Amino acid sequence: GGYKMSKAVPFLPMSPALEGYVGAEEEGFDPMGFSLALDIRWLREAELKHGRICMLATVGWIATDLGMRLPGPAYQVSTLEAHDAMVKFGPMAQILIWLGIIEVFSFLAITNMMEGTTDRQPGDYGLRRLYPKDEEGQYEMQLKELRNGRLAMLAFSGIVTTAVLTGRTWPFXXXXX
Amino acid sequence: ARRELAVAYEDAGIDLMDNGKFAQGLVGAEAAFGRYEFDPIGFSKYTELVPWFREAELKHGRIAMLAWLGLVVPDFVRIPGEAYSFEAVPRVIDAHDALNADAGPNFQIILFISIVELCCAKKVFEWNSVETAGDYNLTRLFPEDDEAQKQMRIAELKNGRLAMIAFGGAVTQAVITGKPFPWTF
Amino acid sequence: FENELGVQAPTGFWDPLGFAKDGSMKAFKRRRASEIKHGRIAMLATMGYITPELTGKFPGLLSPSMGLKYEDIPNGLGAISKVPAVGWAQILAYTFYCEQSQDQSEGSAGEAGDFGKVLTSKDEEGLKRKLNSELANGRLAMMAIIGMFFQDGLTGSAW
Amino acid sequence: ESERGAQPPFGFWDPLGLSADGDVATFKRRRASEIKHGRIAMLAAMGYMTPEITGKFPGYLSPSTGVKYADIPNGLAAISKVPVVGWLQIFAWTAVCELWEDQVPGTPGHEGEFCFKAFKVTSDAPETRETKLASELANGRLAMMAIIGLFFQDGLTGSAY
Amino acid sequence: AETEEGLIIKPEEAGKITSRDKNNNPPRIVVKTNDWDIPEYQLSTGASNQVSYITPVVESEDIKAWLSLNVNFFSIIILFTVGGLIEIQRFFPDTLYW
Numbered sequence: 104g105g106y107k108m109s110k111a112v113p114f115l116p117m118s119p120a121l122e123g124y125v126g127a128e129e130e131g132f133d134p135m136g137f138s139l140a141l142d143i144r145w146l147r148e149a150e151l152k153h154g155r156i157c158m159l160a161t162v163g164w165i166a167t168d169l170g171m172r173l174p175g176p177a178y179q180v181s182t183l184e185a186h187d188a189m190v191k192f193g194p195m196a197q198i199l200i201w202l203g204i205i206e207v208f209s210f211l212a213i214t215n216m217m218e219g220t221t222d223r224q225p226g227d228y229g230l231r232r233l234y235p236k237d238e239e240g241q242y243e244m245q246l247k248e249l250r251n252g253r254l255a256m257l258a259f260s261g262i263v264t265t266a267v268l269t270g271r272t273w274p275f276x277x278x279x280x
Numbered sequence: 281a282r283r284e285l286a287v288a289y290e291d292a293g294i295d296l297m298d299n300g301k302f303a304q305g306l307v308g309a310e311a312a313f314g315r316y317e318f319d320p321i322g323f324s325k326y327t328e329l330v331p332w333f334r335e336a337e338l339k340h341g342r343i344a345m346l347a348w349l350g351l352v353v354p355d356f357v358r359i360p361g362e363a364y365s366f367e368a369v370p371r372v373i374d375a376h377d378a379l380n381a382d383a384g385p386n387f388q389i390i391l392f393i394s395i396v397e398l399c400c401a402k403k404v405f406e407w408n409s410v411e412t413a414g415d416y417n418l419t420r421l422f423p424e425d426d427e428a429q430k431q432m433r434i435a436e437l438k439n440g441r442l443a444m445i446a447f448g449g450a451v452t453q454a455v456i457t458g459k460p461f462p463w464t465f
Numbered sequence: 466f467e468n469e470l471g472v473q474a475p476t477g478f479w480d481p482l483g484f485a486k487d488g489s490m491k492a493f494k495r496r497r498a499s500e501i502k503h504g505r506i507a508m509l510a511t512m513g514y515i516t517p518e519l520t521g522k523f524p525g526l527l528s529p530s531m532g533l534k535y536e537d538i539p540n541g542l543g544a545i546s547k548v549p550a551v552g553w554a555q556i557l558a559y560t561f562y563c564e565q566s567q568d569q570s571e572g573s574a575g576e577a578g579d580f581g582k583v584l585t586s587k588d589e590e591g592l593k594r595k596l597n598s599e600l601a602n603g604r605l606a607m608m609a610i611i612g613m614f615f616q617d618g619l620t621g622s623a624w
Numbered sequence: 625e626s627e628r629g630a631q632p633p634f635g636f637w638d639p640l641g642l643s644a645d646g647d648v649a650t651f652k653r654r655r656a657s658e659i660k661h662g663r664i665a666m667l668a669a670m671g672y673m674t675p676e677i678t679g680k681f682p683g684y685l686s687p688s689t690g691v692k693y694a695d696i697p698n699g700l701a702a703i704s705k706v707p708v709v710g711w712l713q714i715f716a717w718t719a720v721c722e723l724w725e726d727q728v729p730g731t732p733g734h735e736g737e738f739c740f741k742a743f744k745v746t747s748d749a750p751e752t753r754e755t756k757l758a759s760e761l762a763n764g765r766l767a768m769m770a771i772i773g774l775f776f777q778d779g780l781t782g783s784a785y
Numbered sequence: 786a787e788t789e790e791g792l793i794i795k796p797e798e799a800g801k802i803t804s805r806d807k808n809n810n811p812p813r814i815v816v817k818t819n820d821w822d823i824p825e826y827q828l829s830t831g832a833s834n835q836v837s838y839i840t841p842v843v844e845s846e847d848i849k850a851w852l853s854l855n856v857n858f859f860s861i862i863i864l865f866t867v868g869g870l871i872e873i874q875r876f877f878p879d880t881l882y883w
């Protein structure tokens with residue numbers, strides 16, 4: 104009967120920037136009010152980019168720890184030293200160049216979306232594969248992407264911290280604490 | 281009469297007027313034999329901060345109520361493990377010094393308490409009125425009638441005030457004695 | 466509330482102290498919901514007390530990194546120090562995901578937790594007979610489980 | 625609830641109870657549960673016979689741990705030899721089917737009908753479609769009884785047969 | 786534009802207007818200050834979850850216009866020239882080819 108109360112934090116009203124967006128109006132989690140201080144479109148873009156980066160990085164860490172390697176003796180290093188070894192090897196610089204060109208295109212997308220020159224949704228790059236045709240299907244698919252991205256972000260955080268703390272491959276089950 | 285935060289929040293903010301009551305008509309003053317409006321230093325005369333002060337009083341009482349129960353239970357049971365055994369940390373008070381910093385236990389408690397506080401901080405400053413001060417929607421056993429709601433509100437405040445004072449003795453008596461739960465010499 | 470199930474036959478409205486003799490539908494809603502949930506938990510608890518002693522001790526290792534297998538741990542009050550506290554934390558956290566989630570409810574019914582483990586809506590007096598039977602079984606389980614736990618405190622364990 | 629799909633010979637509206645009280649949803653639910661086992665039991669029965677006579681047993685199953693797909697003991701003894709990682713991947717994948725593709729339980733959809741362009745059948749109209757539907761139902765319960773017979777024979781003696 | 790729904794009211798009706806918003810935020814008082822950098826300071830009437838961005842408003846057009854300023858142009862060109870000279874010196878030191 105009063106404020107549109109946030110579902111996540113029941114004692115804090117939902118921020119108006121969370122209306123009509125993916126995720127958002129199912130949980131409305133924003134107690135610190137970051138959406139009240141920054142554009143919701145930019146926050147959503149950053150969230151989706153972080154989710155995708157983490158979903159790739161978590162699986163990369165899993166594959167590297169479990170023993171999957173490229174057929175080169177230069178890659179016979181642990182996942183912890185993989186970054187430094189490959190930075191000194193060269194491929195990290197090339198990966199950075201390629202991610203740089205892709206991020207130049209992403210920056211153009213953001214600039215042309217925030218200025219309204221295009222009609223782009225925050226995280227949309229045009230890729231429409233396995234995307235439901237029905238609008239509710241699209242909304243719930245975007246929900247699934249967001250949930251998986253957030254889960255992978257937290258999971259990769261834990262994986263990196265535990266791997267550094269205990270020299271051990273991904274499952275960390277044995278360990279000692 | 282416990283308006284839900286959903287609507288109660290529509291009358292929140294720094295009130296610039298005076299109710300004319302003791303502390304803007306807030307619970308905690310009614311004593312046993314009558315009223316015991318206490319404030320002798322006139323802190324409640326700064327009526328703009330009365331919702332804030334009540335929030336601080338409730339927050340302190342809630343921490344102290346757990347904290348006093350904190351110093352009691354370790355003296356009779358401890359978490360299953362060697363780091364918390366009665367031989368590694370004999371008395372309860374030597375826990376902030378033992379389990380802290382690089383150890384991990386206290387540091388994690390600091391972080392997750394920080395996360396909760398940084399999330400429930402917008403309720404302390406914004407959305408905090410003389411009506412929804414300390415109300416975090418967790419009203420399960422709250423009575424429905426107005427007068428009984430006042431008793432439970434009065435019950436929490438008196439218990440919180442007591443624990444605040446009781447905890448002060450608890451650490452002071454324990455530190456000067458190094459003794460189990462009854463901190464008498 | 467003289468029709469909200471629970472009044473099967475051996476006794477009618479069993480409210481000696483009159484703890485629900487005021488008409489507070491909110492308090493009764495809380496009381497019935499907690500009553501039903503306790504029946505459900507005691508039903509699983511009593512089943513969890515009898516079986517590991519009788520048979521069925523789970524095959525593998527509870528904590529392979531500590532060698533502890535399900536057979537080794539005791540059955541009853543006393544296992545709370547043998548099941549690792551991390552395991553107890555997982556037991557609490559999972560049941561949280563099933564009590565405050567997967568089964569979090571409001572403005573629906575007494576204890577109609579929605580999902581559940583299949584979404585299924587019945588009809589007819591058969592619902593009444595089954596639902597009353599569930600309350601009767603839960604009441605017996607609640608009495609039984611405190612009996613098993615209290616006895617084991619003053620009888621050790623097993624026979 | 626006596627003239628819907630399951631009206632075979634050697635029995636018609638087979639009662640022992642559990643069919644009265646006139647609940648359309650229960651028939652829509654139990655029959656779905658009936659077919660969902662049939663589509664499972666048929667595969668469960670076939671998976672219990674084909675790696676005994678045909679004996680394809682191709683390649684390797686867990687190259688890290690060996691566990692060649694030829695040395696796996698057929699039957700109930702198999703759930704122990706196949707790595708638990710593999711069993712988890714089987715359950716998790718079938719969950720994806722159960723909740724994302726070919727098993728999204730749309731309520732307007734029929735008792736056992738959804739997107740089924742991925743094999744199974746995608747016919748139309750009725751008559752022969754209904755007789756095929758009764759064929760699916762009839763085979764499933766034959767398989768349902770058979771597979772538990774295979775399990776009981778397996779666990780009791782020493783192996784599947 | 787950014788306050789399409791604020792129920793913005795003038796000082797003269799500070800205690801008169803009460804219709805809150807499309808949200809439940811109370812009406813905000815607009816004070817017309819004479820500063821050009823802050824032409825209008827908005828004051829609240831109560832607790833509100835108002836979306837006030839702290840980020841600036843920049844656009845590609847005037848950022849490019851700033852980079853088209855003679856300082857930026859003649860600094861980018863001279864920086865590239867100096868860097869090219871340094872790179873040539875690194876790659877062909879001591880002008881051995883001469």
Ligand code: CLA
Pocket residue numbers: 466467468469470471472476477478479480483484485486493496497498499500503604605607608
């Ligand atoms: C948490 C447990 C719990 C709860 C919340 C309820 C709640 C309820 N029961 Mg119920 N019941 C229970 C356990 C419980 N019961 C058990 C174990 C039995 C078996 C004896 C019954 C048998 C029973 C019958 C036969 C009937 C009810 C009915 C009711 C409803 C109205 C009566 C009332 O006001 O009770 C309020 C609940 C309480 C006051 C519970 C307080 C119990 C205290 C805390 C302890 C009791 C003694 C305990 C064993 C001491 C432990 C010893 C240890 C401390 C040393 C109400 C919703 C009636 C109904 O259906 O109404 C329509 C009805 O006819 N109950």
Ligand SMILES: CC(=O)O[C@H]1CC(C)(C)C(=C=C/C(C)=C/C=C/C(C)=C/C=C/C=C(C)/C=C/C=C(C)/C=C/[C@@]23O[C@]2(C)C[C@@H](O)CC3(C)C)[C@](C)(O)C1
Pocket residue numbers: 700772775776777778779780781
């Ligand atoms: C060493 C040695 O030689 O010993 C051998 C022994 C042996 C036995 C031979 C072995 C074997 C073979 C096997 C694998 C035997 C398996 C038996 C199974 C799978 C039984 C499952 C029953 C599921 C049921 C009833 C689900 C039922 C679902 C029901 C009832 C639903 C019931 C509803 O009430 C609910 C839930 C809601 C109601 O409203 C409606 C209805 C439908 C009634 C061993 C273990 O390998 C080794």
Ligand code: KC1
Pocket residue numbers: 276277527528529530531548549551552553555556557559560
């Ligand atoms: C798929 C998610 C998942 C994983 C991946 C996982 C993994 C591990 N669980 Mg867990 N678990 C659940 C989910 C998962 N568990 C759920 C839903 C429950 C129901 C409540 C549950 C219960 C218990 C209990 C009772 C114990 C337990 C433990 C371990 C353990 C051992 C560590 C080790 O080998 O050292 C590992 C690796 C035992 C333990 O010893 O924990 C220290 C133990 O006591 N678990």
Ligand code: KC1
Pocket residue numbers: 685686687688689706707709710711713714715717718
């Ligand atoms: C396309 C994605 C995909 C990848 C990338 C992948 C990878 C691996 N699978 Mg998997 N898999 C599926 C998909 C994928 N699997 C699907 C849809 C199913 C049916 C539901 C399935 C079933 C099994 C089974 C039954 C086993 C199995 C295994 C391994 C294994 C071994 C590692 C090692 O031995 O080096 C690796 C690398 C074996 C195992 O032991 O895993 C540890 C084993 O037993 N898989």
Ligand SMILES: CC1=C(C#C/C(C)=C/C=C/C(C)=C/C=C/C=C(C)/C=C/C=C(C)/C=C/[C@@]23O[C@]2(C)C[C@@H](O)CC3(C)C)C(C)(C)C[C@H](O)C1
Pocket residue numbers: 373376377444445447448449451452455
């Ligand atoms: C963190 C840390 C530690 C610590 C600590 C901590 C948290 C210490 C905390 C100490 C604390 C919390 C000390 C409170 C005192 C409160 C007092 C004295 C109140 C008096 C009030 C008085 C005397 C008067 C009260 C009344 O007048 C009132 C108000 C009204 C009258 O009607 C009734 C009376 C007259 C009775 C360790 C564990 C010690 C060592 C470790 O290494 C480092």
